[PDB]
Amino acid sequence: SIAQARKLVEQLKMEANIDRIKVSKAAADLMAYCEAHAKEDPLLTPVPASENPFRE
């Protein structure tokens, strides 16, 4: 098929021109984000009672 192969080639060519950052520069960012919001996660560090909505 000369109609679908052209679209596939165009799509493949359009995705190979993207700039990529080195790995270990994106894992560091994930680690930093996880570290900077540690105290705002009630599931990681549970909040004391009288602050939990479903204490009951």
Contact residues for another protein, defined by CB under 8 A: 1-2, 5-6, 8-9, 11-16, 18, 20-31, 33-34, 37-38, 40-44, 46-47, 52-56
User: Measured between alpha carbons, how far is 39 from 36 in angstroms, rounded to an integer?
Assistant: 8
Q: Which is nearer to another protein, 23 or 50 (CB)?
A: 23
Query: What are the helix (H) ranges across 1-56?
Result: 4-15, 27-36
Question: Closest approach of Cβ 35 to another protein, in Å?
Answer: 9
Question: Closest approach of Cβ 50 to another protein, in Å?
Answer: 14
Largest distance between two CA atoms of the chain: 67
